[PDB]
Each structure stands twice: as structure tokens, then as C-alpha cells.
Symmetry: C3
Subunit: 136 residues, 3 copies
């Protein structure tokens, strides 16, 4: 039993991200733009949404496993980390890892998936050494 | 104390195991021999299928030794295994080295599998932040 | 509300810190000056070691700004830091740009460290799944 995730469609022309099956970890995010990535090239692509990740959680942006195999699409900073206080637009750093074939992304194509998990907001405690702290 | 049910689709590989008690992952083996030229990728079978419980997610992470040593990565890292998936775990291996091919043989440890809780949030559209 | 024991192996770097209260990671610093030629990688010392609690995992993620602006990535992203690991955290940086080098300085923020719970699942072999 979870909470909600407040989401804004900055681009009202794209579908609302949704969970394709009940247990699926992620919701698909769409591209708000048309872009062509030549081999080895990247772009920062707008998804047309902003979210409010709850305090104590994190949003995580993962690549889609299909396009990964089929054409080599990946995310430079995978997993992209969406902090709880971030209210800006989610943008995805796509990259074409194929050596030869460009990748054409159309507005409205699914380009990544977004997960939400709890994160432990640890307090760091400096210790002189693991030995002196009893942590061998 | 959670159990992960697992099928050895390939009975000739060892069962994945957790090498030390608190290690986050269990290592997955390759069921095949593959050779990756610089910059090339392959979808490699592990020989196993799993049953990620509802409320959880399976995560396929690259191994650090091979990453540094030969440039071995995973295109879709972290590879996401949904609770509903009962097919074979396949690893989208890639050679990020510019010049040296990567050899993988059957039986090699090619990735690690983590299981975590996931928050199955209900998206609610709102006007603005 | 967890704590994380950390050692500064390199005493001349700032202790990692959490920039804003709910931010998922603490940024890790390079202990070294390296130039990464296009497509090339390097194992970069961060100057710290940690004791990830039992039942948890430390995760090393790339920084998003550097990822776009220059193509800096991490080959084993997300880097997996096991609870029993007491060595130095090292980051496997890789310049995924086709043409421009990346200069990394000592003191630059080069990755972030998240700590999450992990399910230390007991693998149990079955003949088949229930259909
Ligand atoms: O490293 C991986 C990642 C995913 N999958 C399988 C399991 C997922 O539930 C399904 C994902 O398909 P997508 O909807 O992301 O394309 O594929 C794998 O075998 N290995
Ligand atoms: O895939 C990503 C990753 C991050 N960010 C946004 C949200 C983060 O909370 C913020 C700052 O990123 P960093 O400087 O921490 O890496 O950028 C994205 O839009 N997409
Ligand atoms: O980014 C990383 C990833 C791993 N390690 C260390 C810690 C791990 O516990 C150990 C084992 O590596 P793996 O094969 O589990 O990834 O290497 C690092 O210093 N940095
Ligand atoms: Mg999916
Ligand atoms: Mg290990
Ligand atoms: Mg940050």
C-alpha cells in the first residue's frame, strides 16, 4: 500500500505516464520532442512532466530494456536521480551506443521509465578508522 | 527472510548464490560464449528465471572488476525485472572499450541481481507546483 | 534516521555532505587529477571508505549535470557497495563523448552515494512456476 505521486503535465499533449501492469516497477515517460541521435551522440530530452517525489523517497530514471537491445539506446546518467525537493521538468540524457545506425525518437515515444523507492537519508558520522570504531 | 523462487532453465550452471551474508547481490552466470568487438552489444542468456514478489523489483547491475578491467557494461543498467515477469533473465552486455574485444564464456559471472522493495505509487495529475 | 560511518582516507577533501535535507545522495569527490580522452575510462579514488549497514546497500550514481554537459558516465553504474566492504570507494568514470576530452580535478564532485535497504533474498530453486 503506497502513497500518491503528484504529477504535472507541462506538456498537455502527451499522455499521462501510467503503470502498464499492477506490479510493474516503473511508469513509462514519453519524449516531448522529435530528435535524431547519430552513433555515439547524446541529447537532453524533455519528457513534458514534473513530479513531487515524497520526502524519504527518490525518483529513479531507468532505460527501457527493449530499445536498449534493439537499437542501443541508453541513458548517460542511468539511473537518473530525482530528489524529493525537485519540481522542475524531468529531462532524460539519451545516448546512442550503436556504432552505425542512428536512432530517431518521435514526440510521444516512450523513452525511459520512472521508479520510486524509499531512500535512507543517512547521517554521516566521521570515524578515525574502522579499527578504532570497532568496524573491521 | 524473503524468498526468491528461481528456475534453472539451464540445469548445467550452478545456482546463483550470495557470496557473503550481507552482499546486496547474487551473481548471474552466462549460459553462452559470446565475443564482443569494441562498441558491440549482445543479449546474453543467464539460464535462470525468477519470481520477483509483488511489491518488489529485480535489478540487474554490472560487476565492478570487469567494468574497469575490460570496459564491460550493460546497456540498460540497471536492468529492471518486474514482479510479473517469469521469462529468462537476459543481460544486454556491451563493450565500452575502444580497441580490445571482450570474451565471455559459458559459466562466467556476468552481472549481479538485487531485489528491493519498490513504491507502487498512484500518479495523480495536479495543476502546478 | 540511519547513520553511516565514513572514513576520510584522504584528509584534504571535504567530508561528503547532503546538500538539501531530502536529497537522495551525498556527493563524492575525486582525490585525483585525470584527463579522460574520448571513449576512455579510469578508476578514480574518492578518498573515502564507508560501512554500509547490514540489510542495506550503497549505490554510486552519476551526476546528471556532468552527464549531459560533457558525456561523463560510470561504466558499472549503479556502482554496488556491499555491506561488508571496507575498502576505498573508487568510481569507474568513462568519457562517452566522441571527440572532446574531460578534465577531472581533485576536489570536483564526481558521483553521488545513496544508501537503500536491500532484500537479502534466500534463493530457492523450483521445478517450475505456478501458472
Ligand atoms: O536486464 C534485464 C532487464 C529486463 N529484462 C526483462 C524483464 C522485465 O520485466 C522485462 C522488461 O521489458 P521492458 O518493459 O523494460 O522493455 O524484460 C531482462 O531479462 N533483463
Ligand atoms: O535523469 C534525470 C536526473 C536528474 N534530473 C534533475 C532532477 C535532480 O534532482 C536534478 C539535479 O541533478 P544533479 O545535479 O544531482 O545530478 O536534476 C532530471 O531531470 N533527470
Ligand atoms: O562503484 C563501485 C562499485 C564497487 N566498488 C567495490 C565495492 C564492492 O562491494 C566491491 C565488489 O564489486 P562488485 O563485483 O559487487 O560490483 O567493489 C567500488 O569501490 N566502487
Ligand atoms: Mg516495462
Ligand atoms: Mg560480489
Ligand atoms: Mg545532488
Amino acid at each position: 500500500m503506497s502513497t500518491t505521486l503528484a504529477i504535472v503535465r507541462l506538456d498537455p499533449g502527451l499522455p499521462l505516464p501510467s503503470r502498464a501492469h499492477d506490479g510493474d516497477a516503473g511508469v513509462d515517460l514519453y519524449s516531448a520532442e522529435d530528435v535524431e541521435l547519430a552513433p555515439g551522440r547524446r541529447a537532453l530530452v524533455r519528457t513534458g512532466v514534473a513530479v513531487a517525489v515524497p520526502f524519504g523517497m527518490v525518483g529513479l530514471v531507468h532505460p527501457r530494456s527493449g530499445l536498449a537491445t534493439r537499437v542501443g539506446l541508453s541513458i548517460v546518467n542511468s539511473p537518473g536521480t530525482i530528489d524529493a525537493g525537485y519540481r522542475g521538468e524531468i529531462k532524460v540524457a539519451l545516448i546512442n551506443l550503436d556504432p552505425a545506425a542512428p536512432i530517431v525518437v518521435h514526440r510521444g515515444d516512450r523513452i525511459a521509465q520512472l521508479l520510486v523507492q524509499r531512500v535512507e537519508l543517512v547521517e554521516l558520522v566521521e570515524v578515525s578508522s574502522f579499527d578504532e570504531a570497532g568496524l573491521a
